[PDB]
Design an enzyme around this catalytic site. Structure first.
Site, PDB file in Angstrom:
ATOM      1  N   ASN B  11       0.856  -1.201   0.000  1.00 11.62           N
ATOM      2  CA  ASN B  11       0.000   0.000   0.000  1.00 11.62           C
ATOM      3  C   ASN B  11       0.892   1.251   0.000  1.00 11.62           C
ATOM      4  O   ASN B  11       1.388   1.661   1.031  1.00 11.62           O
ATOM      5  CB  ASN B  11      -0.952  -0.065   1.200  1.00 11.62           C
ATOM      6  CG  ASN B  11      -1.850   1.155   1.380  1.00 11.62           C
ATOM      7  OD1 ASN B  11      -2.092   1.909   0.454  1.00 11.62           O
ATOM      8  ND2 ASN B  11      -2.420   1.277   2.574  1.00 11.62           N
ATOM      9  N   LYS B  13      -0.108   4.175  -0.117  1.00 11.39           N
ATOM     10  CA  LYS B  13      -0.832   5.298   0.480  1.00 11.39           C
ATOM     11  C   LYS B  13      -0.731   6.537  -0.423  1.00 11.39           C
ATOM     12  O   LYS B  13      -0.703   6.400  -1.638  1.00 11.39           O
ATOM     13  CB  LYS B  13      -0.336   5.479   1.928  1.00 11.39           C
ATOM     14  CG  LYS B  13      -0.436   4.190   2.788  1.00 11.39           C
ATOM     15  CD  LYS B  13      -0.240   4.538   4.296  1.00 11.39           C
ATOM     16  CE  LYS B  13      -0.227   3.195   5.107  1.00 11.39           C
ATOM     17  NZ  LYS B  13      -0.205   3.497   6.602  1.00 11.39           N
ATOM     18  N   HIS B  95      -9.442   0.466   5.003  1.00  6.53           N
ATOM     19  CA  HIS B  95      -8.148   0.779   5.627  1.00  6.53           C
ATOM     20  C   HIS B  95      -8.379   1.591   6.897  1.00  6.53           C
ATOM     21  O   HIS B  95      -9.304   2.408   6.978  1.00  6.53           O
ATOM     22  CB  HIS B  95      -7.259   1.593   4.636  1.00  6.53           C
ATOM     23  CG  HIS B  95      -5.837   1.642   5.120  1.00  6.53           C
ATOM     24  ND1 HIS B  95      -5.402   2.644   5.923  1.00  6.53           N
ATOM     25  CD2 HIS B  95      -4.806   0.777   4.972  1.00  6.53           C
ATOM     26  CE1 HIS B  95      -4.132   2.429   6.282  1.00  6.53           C
ATOM     27  NE2 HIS B  95      -3.739   1.302   5.661  1.00  6.53           N
ATOM     28  N   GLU B  97      -6.962   4.311   7.973  1.00  9.53           N
ATOM     29  CA  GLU B  97      -7.018   5.742   7.692  1.00  9.53           C
ATOM     30  C   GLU B  97      -8.410   6.115   7.141  1.00  9.53           C
ATOM     31  O   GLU B  97      -8.923   7.184   7.444  1.00  9.53           O
ATOM     32  CB  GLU B  97      -5.869   6.027   6.703  1.00  9.53           C
ATOM     33  CG  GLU B  97      -4.506   5.925   7.422  1.00  9.53           C
ATOM     34  CD  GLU B  97      -3.455   5.396   6.485  1.00  9.53           C
ATOM     35  OE1 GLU B  97      -3.691   5.407   5.307  1.00  9.53           O
ATOM     36  OE2 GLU B  97      -2.401   4.956   6.972  1.00  9.53           O
ATOM     37  N   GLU B 168      -4.459  -5.075  10.489  1.00  7.76           N
ATOM     38  CA  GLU B 168      -3.452  -4.055  10.771  1.00  7.76           C
ATOM     39  C   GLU B 168      -3.818  -3.253  12.034  1.00  7.76           C
ATOM     40  O   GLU B 168      -4.572  -2.302  11.978  1.00  7.76           O
ATOM     41  CB  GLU B 168      -3.379  -3.057   9.611  1.00  7.76           C
ATOM     42  CG  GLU B 168      -2.974  -3.765   8.320  1.00  7.76           C
ATOM     43  CD  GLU B 168      -2.641  -2.776   7.220  1.00  7.76           C
ATOM     44  OE1 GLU B 168      -3.444  -1.853   6.958  1.00  7.76           O
ATOM     45  OE2 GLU B 168      -1.603  -2.935   6.606  1.00  7.76           O
ATOM     46  N   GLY B 174       2.925   2.814  10.782  1.00 11.29           N
ATOM     47  CA  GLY B 174       3.881   3.922  10.568  1.00 11.29           C
ATOM     48  C   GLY B 174       4.635   4.394  11.830  1.00 11.29           C
ATOM     49  O   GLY B 174       5.202   5.499  11.828  1.00 11.29           O
ATOM     50  N   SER B 214       4.094  -1.598  10.117  1.00 10.24           N
ATOM     51  CA  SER B 214       5.533  -1.596  10.409  1.00 10.24           C
ATOM     52  C   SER B 214       6.221  -2.887   9.987  1.00 10.24           C
ATOM     53  O   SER B 214       7.204  -3.285  10.617  1.00 10.24           O
ATOM     54  CB  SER B 214       5.778  -1.318  11.887  1.00 10.24           C
ATOM     55  OG  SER B 214       5.138  -0.093  12.266  1.00 10.24           O
TER      56      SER B 214
END
Lengths: 250, 250
Positions: B11, B13, B95, B97, B168, B174, B214
């Site tokens: 991904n 992003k 996702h 986000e 996730e 991140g 990560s």
């Protein structure tokens, strides 16, 4: 008379395909150039690069939305940096559908405006009231709040020259219930004086306030005649040959 | 002992540019990661067609999001029909986000899964808990609610063959705060047991449940050893050349 050049936007929204677009754009390039109208199309991200390279630089090509930083951990977002990298210079922000449907805050539209303008793009922020707000007599309350949150995002005073506002009453989007010339004139007039009082005479003087809400080939000429209407943001009709007629509305 | 093929998605992003895209894809194009791995790349909408056009059929190319209707008045949205039109058959949905920054509900993620699967795409729905729901002991309740709303959008049991789940944890996204191998295995195991009871034994034993958050070349092998972790959804490290080594983690 003012110094405001007529502005026509075509928002395709979520419509388009390779085969659909190539025919649409041909129609567009087929029409004779008119040095008196600023013409924009706002196309889906997946076509944005491709549309830009299939239209002479005369026409502005816009993204239908963006986010507020250049890069980062925002799955499914597009930045002004990516728009420019696709050959493009315009973005529509805070369309009613992003605000009411996708829930984007007056504050977030502010930050997107700030970021887009800091990256050297031109913006089209949208304002307007829903049907329920109009039945409740909150038209003015709504537009003012929305405009306050737009100026709060403007980097500097001079950047207002890269802003075109569109007023789109939500009850007029898709419904076939275009605001009358008098209804639109009333709001546009109130917007320009709000810009006088809350921004600057010079900004109110030069800002193009465009109307959005079921603009067709049959009603555009009466609306464009009104002194505070500087153009349109066309939705449905932007996908049809009549869009050309609507570009010739002034 | 399972039938499940190793799956590694990248991904990107909100990162990409035609320049840095060519560089990334070259590293990935020139290398030859395991033919025993499905490799997926999820790119920004603006560069989606170009990436599919310049990446081998060895690779899947995904959108990072889509909407739940084929065409319409949804400014800023991309449909499954437009993704297919761009030559691509995969979409990441739900996702973290997209749920926590951009306000997408469980019911919306469900309906998007419904529409994407109906339109023939393959989907990577994403589930996981934030640093606070973990510190509250609600990982399971959170992931189960997430899972039920995805199951509600499966139009029929056969469609689960076009589903890859990505777990996730938001606290691993991140930050460098990787789940331990044992922390992944425990969640994945429990997810697979939830599946086993609420859908099928056929569906549970065949579904890839992947980890992201990560993932790097330095930690991927210990996570990949765990029997109910079937691969990865890599963010940050998908922009770096070590993405190839994460493709080789099994």
């Amino acid at each position: 008379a003012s110094n405001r050049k007529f502005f026509v936007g075509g928002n395709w929204k979520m419509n388009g395909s390779k085969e659909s677009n190539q025919k649409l754009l041909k129609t567009l390039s087929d029409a004779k150039p008119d040095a008196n109208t600023e013409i924009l199309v706002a196309v889906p991200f997946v076509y944005l690069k491709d549309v830009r390279e299939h239209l002479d630089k005369r026409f502005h090509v816009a993204a239908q939305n963006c986010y507020k930083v250049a890069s980062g951990a925002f799955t499914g977002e597009i930045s002004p940096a990516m728009i420019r990298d696709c050959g493009c210079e315009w973005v529509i922000l805070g369309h009613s559908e992003r605000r009411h449907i996708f829930g984007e805050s007056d504050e977030l539209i502010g930050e997107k405006v700030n970021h887009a303008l800091t990256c050297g793009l031109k913006v089209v922020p949208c304002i307007g009231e829903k049907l329920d707000e109009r039945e409740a007599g909150k038209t003015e309350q709504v537009c003012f709040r929305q405009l306050d949150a737009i100026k709060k995002g403007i980097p500097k005073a001079e950047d207002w020259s890269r802003v075109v506002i569109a007023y789109e009453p939500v009850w007029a989007i898709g419904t076939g219930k275009t605001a009358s010339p008098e209804q639109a004139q009333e709001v546009h007039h109130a917007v320009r004086q709000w810009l006088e009082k809350n921004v600057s005479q010079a900004v109110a003087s030069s800002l193009r306030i465009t109307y959005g809400g079921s603009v067709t080939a049959a009603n555009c000429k009466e609306l464009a005649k009104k002194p505070d209407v500087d153009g349109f943001l066309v939705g449905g009709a932007s996908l049809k040959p009549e869009f050309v007629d609507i570009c010739n509305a002034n």
